[PDB]
Design a protein around this ligand. Structure first.
Ligand SMILES: CC(=O)N[C@@H]1[C@@H](O[C@@H]2O[C@H](C(=O)O)[C@@H](O[C@@H]3O[C@H](CO)[C@@H](O)[C@H](O[C@@H]4O[C@H](C(=O)O)[C@@H](O[C@@H]5O[C@H](CO)[C@@H](O)[C@H](O[C@@H]6O[C@H](C(=O)O)[C@H](O)[C@H](O)[C@H]6O)[C@H]5NC(C)=O)[C@H](O)[C@H]4O)[C@H]3NC(C)=O)[C@H](O)[C@H]2O)[C@H](O)[C@@H](CO)O[C@H]1O
Length: 721
């Protein structure tokens, strides 16, 4: 029966499927329609038919694994899309309609109703299944009665009664916070419309609006652009995605209800985009260090996961106006055009999204200009992201602290993420595929790049830990220059290290002092473990003389430099050792399967070649010291190592410092309150992290106390001579 609720649901249909927009002459839309035709055909030839059955689809028959509830309903939802699309061969097909109806009823009676309790994992009962049911009913509302729609959604009201709290019917209720708050929103607003219920719509809206508050603790967005979820995990790039994805689908609907959303909170969303998401997006890639356990999914590599954010941003634009619409359109267009590696359209799954993207890409009013340089210090989630537009590389630094969990191993995903936050660094260069094409199941998880570790074996069943120390964070001076440290202790308290990083515009210095080991295991720092491309061989130099690398590890004592030379400058990698160091290197084929790291994934064998560089720490008090210099040619690299010969100022147990004489910049880490005099020009006074620039006779000063999470008045921490 038709009224304002179903007008709203027509708008929902246009957002979730978008059949009104479908155009058979449009190549990209036709491809999506063909994917759905094939899905519906496999479902239809597959389904159990005849006398009453124990399951609908065999491959999804164990109703005690809850992923099979939602997988089952998502098949019915595809049918619904195709049944209401005029260019589908299944358009108003009598078999598809009866099939969706008897299948809704079959599930209602044997698998998913109000007398059921949660078995397996709750997200299925409260979010995934509900959303699939809501979408099915809404697409197909003209084939169900109001009484049937109420029947099929009563279960949604049992598992999710409350605008606010999540899991309430279990023996362990909670606070739906962050992206689950938005996921609840999609569940409840839409059942709300479906059931013709005004209280449920308004109170669910009032309740989603709390997502717009900045927090000081726990889950949500922080004023420095960090995003936290699952209590203490850096999560912008998986749950932050869900929150932007989901809100951006709902808002055109929410804005036409009795209870629209004040347009001053739209300014908070724009801020999330600029402060939180945008710095994480590099050449079309969403940095893995922000994606938690999703890094272990073959179907969600970085460039794919990026699209979830981009389509959310592009939806926000379409409900904005004037200058802000155009600016967000350009943000999206410039990211999509930078990406020579992944085709955006492969993760646009409604016609309306395809349409919005096509028009943005071909509208010459919308500027596509290369992104400018930036440096975001996400102290509130212990991450840093840097990007240099001049030379064209990004850099990601994944830490953790007392305030945050190192890695997330949950629902059998991400089994070997042990060291992904132990000072691991990321380097985004001209190889856009680097962290993709099966990087995660093939990388050696004992040798994560930048980490100092022992070689003990680790168990997959292990879970994440916080760090004993709060002394972890980043002091940002400007968009080119920052410094960080991590007062590092390994997972079983046998190895330590003072690890520090000095971000100096076009290079990063890695310093480590106070390295101590009380285990019987050997210790080492992985300088690099880079995935190679057969199409692009590196020629390797050690001390500026060609080396030939093999499977077997070779030793290179008395090393000042290593240089990885490609035919493409934007893929070059130099390492300059301030003091001669004793290193080892190999190039080897590494194999593994995605199942090895995530129980739900394919067991099919994957392979990639990797080059590993490492430095052994045989004695207590050991030390490392080097400068990563990406994206320059060999002659330029040789010149810079001459410019930098006296750049190391100290690398010991209380003081770590690097000076860039060309910019006039110092990065400095102090572990105690002594008076350190630096380069005969000034003194620093307090334990903490410093980035300092000399401009003529004055000093610009960025000081950060990572433990208290506070800057400080200049005269407490600094004194000119
Ligand atoms: C152990 C325990 O009990 N611990 C509790 C803790 O519980 C845990 O909570 C988390 C959590 O959610 O925070 C759980 O995490 C989730 O686990 C599931 C397991 O299967 C993951 O799948 C899930 O990851 C998400 O899964 C979705 C899914 O497949 O259902 C993904 O779905 C897709 O998302 C798209 C994005 O918008 C969406 O578009 C798409 O639908 C289609 O969209 C179309 C469109 O474009 O419009 C179209 O037209 C279509 O019609 C429409 O179907 C949607 N579905 C599909 C099939 O594609 C989603 O993208 C993916 O991210 C994972 N969550 C995350 C964020 O990764 C964990 O498992 C629980 O154990 C409690 O939370 C805690 C208290 O707070 O206490 C602890 O003790």
């Amino acid at each position: 029966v038709k009224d304002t609720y179903t007008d709203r649901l027509d708008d929902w249909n246009g957002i979730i499927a978008g059949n009104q927009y479908y155009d058979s002459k449009n190549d990209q839309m036709a491809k999506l329609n063909q994917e759905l035709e094939g899905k519906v055909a496999d479902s239809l030839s597959s389904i159990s038919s005849q006398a009453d059955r124990i399951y609908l689809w065999e491959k999804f028959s164990n109703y005690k694994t809850s992923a099979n509830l939602t997988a089952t309903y998502r098949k019915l939802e595809e049918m619904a899309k195709q049944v209401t699309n005029p260019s589908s061969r299944y358009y108003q097909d009598e078999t598809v309609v009866r099939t969706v109806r008897d299948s809704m009823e079959w599930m209602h009676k044997h698998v998913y109703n109000s007398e059921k309790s949660i078995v397996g994992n709750a997200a299925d009962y409260e979010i995934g299944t509900p959303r699939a049911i809501n979408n099915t009913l809404s697409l197909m509302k003209e084939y169900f009665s109001d009484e049937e729609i109420k029947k099929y959604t009563d279960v949604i009201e049992k598992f999710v009664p409350d605008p606010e709290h999540f899991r309430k019917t279990t023996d362990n209720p909670v606070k739906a916070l962050g992206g689950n708050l938005v996921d609840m929103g999609r569940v409840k607003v839409i059942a709300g419309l479906l059931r013709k219920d005004d209280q449920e719509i308004s109170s669910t809206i009032r309740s989603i609006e709390q997502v717009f508050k900045l927090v000081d603790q726990g889950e949500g967005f922080y004023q420095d652009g960090s995003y936290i979820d699952h209590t203490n995990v850096a999560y912008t790039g998986a749950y932050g995605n869900v929150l932007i994805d989901g809100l951006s689908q709902l808002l055109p609907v929410i804005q036409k209800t009795k209870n629209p959303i004040d347009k001053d909170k739209m300014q908070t969303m724009y801020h999330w985009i600029d402060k939180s998401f945008a710095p994480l997006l590099v050449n079309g890639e969403l940095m893995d260090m922000s994606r938690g356990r999703s890094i272990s999914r073959a179907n969600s590599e970085g460039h794919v996961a990026a699209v979830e954010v981009l389509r959310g941003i592009h939806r926000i634009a379409d409900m904005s106006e004037g200058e802000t619409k155009q600016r967000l359109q350009s943000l999206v267009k410039t990211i999509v055009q930078s990406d020579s590696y992944y085709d955006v359209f492969k993760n646009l799954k409604t016609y309306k999204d395809i349409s919005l993207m096509q028009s943005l890409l071909s509208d010459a009013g919308v500027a596509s200009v290369p992104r400018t340089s930036y440096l975001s210090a996400f102290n509130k989630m212990d991450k840093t992201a840097m990007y240099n537009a001049e030379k064209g590389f990004g850099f990601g630094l994944s830490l953790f602290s007392s305030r945050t969990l190192n890695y997330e191993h949950m629902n059998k995903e991400n089994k070997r993420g042990w060291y992904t936050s132990d000072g691991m660094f990321y380097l985004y260069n001209g190889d856009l595929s680097h962290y993709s094409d099966g990087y995660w199941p093939t990388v050696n998880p004992y040798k994560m790049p930048g980490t100092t570790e022992t070689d003990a074996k680790r168990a997959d069943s292990d879970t994440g830990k916080v760090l004993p120390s709060a002394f972890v964070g980043t002091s940002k001076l400007d968009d080119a220059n920052a410094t960080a440290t991590m007062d590092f202790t390994n997972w079983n308290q046998t190895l330590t290290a003072h690890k520090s990083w000095f971000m100096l515009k076009d290079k990063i210095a890695f310093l480590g002092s106070n390295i101590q080991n009380t285990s019987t295991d050997t210790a080492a720092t992985t300088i690099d473990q880079r995935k190679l491309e057969s199409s692009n061989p590196y020629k390797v130099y050690v001390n500026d003389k060609e080396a030939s690398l093999t499977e077997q590890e070779k030793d290179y004592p008395e090393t000042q430099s290593v240089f990885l030379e490609s035919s493409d400058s934007k893929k070059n990698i130099g390492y300059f050792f301030f003091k001669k160091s004793s290193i080892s290197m190999s190039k080897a084929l590494q194999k593994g399967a995605w199942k090895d790291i995530n129980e739900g994934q394919s067991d099919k064998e994957v392979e990639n070649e990797f080059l590993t560089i490492s430095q052994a720490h045989k004695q207590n008090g050991d030390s490392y010291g080097y400068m990563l210099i990406p994206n320059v040619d060999r002659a330029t690299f040789n010149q810079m190592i001459k410019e930098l010969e006296s750049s190391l100022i100290e690398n010991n147990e209380t003081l770590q410092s690097v000076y860039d004489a060309k910019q006039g910049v110092w990065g400095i880490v102090k572990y105690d309150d002594s008076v350190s005099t630096i380069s005969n020009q000034f003194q620093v006074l307090k334990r903490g992290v410093y980035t300092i620039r000399k401009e003529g006779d004055e000093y610009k000063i960025a000081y950060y106390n990572p433990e208290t999470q506070e800057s400080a008045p200049d005269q407490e921490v600094f004194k000119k001579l």
